[PDB]
Write a protein that binds this ligand. Structure first.
Ligand SMILES: C[n+]1cn([C@@H]2O[C@H](COP(=O)(O)OP(=O)(O)O)[C@@H](O)[C@H]2O)c2nc(N)[nH]c(=O)c21
Ligand code: NA
Ligand code: NA
Ligand code: NA
Ligand code: NA
Ligand code: NA
Ligand code: NA
Ligand code: NA
Ligand code: NA
Ligand code: NA
Length: 210
């Protein structure tokens, strides 16, 4: 990708614009994402601990005696989340479930006050991986990600850089991860059937092949 191509991807849930920019803004809480490449050359992706759908559902409750859920969202939730919703009612079965669902996200987080971009990336990578990810080298390319969530009608902005890390894929793939932010770190190329695979793959390719 050249300095001024903008590419717009669409999935059943998201529209996302990816555009190469020169500098990251820094205001209140800028969001910075790490596209991590392992020592053995694998692109990494996180499975968010809480799905976007279950986060939203929880935020929509307003009564101790009423629980409300759009059934369209059931296919975008984890097993434990579905169990929590239906734990008291316990009907025979439920419909529209995807047992393969995972909420794929680039690792990363919010920029602190007067925190450098690279320090933010190092710190968030450490927090989200239980101290198991360190950065050998940062890439040059900076992408701005603009995402519209089609289900909730919200727009999000973040910025992404490449992080070539010291760890191998296997280094991050024996021990389960205990974060409140992340339930798994895995190879993006183990996720070919995910709604997000095409645009995440594009991000990695643009960051390393430009
Ligand atoms: C709640 N939420 C967060 N994101 C993404 O996650 C990034 C950070 O999300 P955040 O809302 O800024 O902080 P949070 O993780 O504590 O919620 C955003 O820049 C978005 O990329 C989300 N992305 C989509 N498509 N839908 C969502 O509901 C959503
Ligand atoms: Na941001
Ligand atoms: Na049952
Ligand atoms: Na149902
Ligand atoms: Na299920
Ligand atoms: Na999905
Ligand atoms: Na994304
Ligand atoms: Na590390
Ligand atoms: Na290591
Ligand atoms: Na998806």
């Amino acid at each position: 990708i050249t300095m001024d191509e903008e590419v717009i991807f669409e999935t059943p849930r998201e529209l996302i614009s990816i555009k190469r920019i020169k500098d990251i803004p820094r205001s209140k809480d800028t969001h910075v994402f790490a596209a991590c490449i392992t020592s053995d050359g694998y692109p990494l992706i996180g499975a968010r601990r809480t799905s976007f759908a279950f986060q939203a559902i929880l935020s929509q409750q307003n009564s101790d005696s009423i629980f409300r859920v759009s059934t369209k969202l059931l296919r975008f939730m984890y097993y434990n989340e579905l169990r929590e919703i239906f734990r008291r009612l316990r009907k025979g079965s439920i419909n529209n479930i995807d047992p393969h669902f995972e909420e794929l996200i680039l690792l990363g987080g919010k920029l602190d006050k007067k925190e450098s971009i690279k320090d933010c990336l190092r710190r968030e990578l450490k927090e989200e991986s239980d101290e198991r990810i360190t950065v050998k080298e940062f890439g040059n390319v900076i992408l701005k990600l603009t995402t519209r969530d089609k289900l909730f009608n919200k727009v999000y902005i973040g910025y992404c850089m490449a992080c070539f890390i010291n760890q191998s894929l296997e280094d991050l793939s024996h021990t389960s991860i205990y974060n409140v932010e992340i339930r798994k770190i895995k190879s993006l190329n183990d996720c070919i059937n995910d709604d997000k695979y095409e645009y995440l793959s594009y991000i990695y390719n643009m960051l390393v092949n430009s």
